[PDB]
Amino acid sequence: AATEKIAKQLQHQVNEIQGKLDEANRTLNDFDSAKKKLSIENSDLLRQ
Amino acid sequence: AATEKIAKQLQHQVNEIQGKLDEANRTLNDFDSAKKKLSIENSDLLRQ
Numbered sequence A, B: 001a002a003t004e005k006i007a008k009q010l011q012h013q014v015n016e017i018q019g020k021l022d023e024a025n026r027t028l029n030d031f032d033s034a035k036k037k038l039s040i041e042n043s044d045l046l047r048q
Helices: A003-046 B002-047
Strands: none
Touching: A003 B002
16 A cells, blocks of 8 residues: 555656646647748748 | 556656657757747848
8 A cells, every 4th residue: 555655646647747748749739830831931922 | 566567667658758758848949949940031031
């Protein structure tokens, strides 16, 4: 019952910190969708 | 002896996905440096 306690107390950390990752990984997504728009706006005007 | 082996299994992941995050937020800083460099030539080209 002692080692199961630090099992669960470590288990709470590994559960949440990927939620910190998945929240942070979402920032890795929408930057890329904003970047491809900023490229195609550059490509549309550099020819002009 | 199962849970003690389980305790390392939660331990091995919680160092692993941490290390993935250290590669992640670095790449978050990389696409940060990509956009701020690219958005400069957005306003620069639109000025020109």
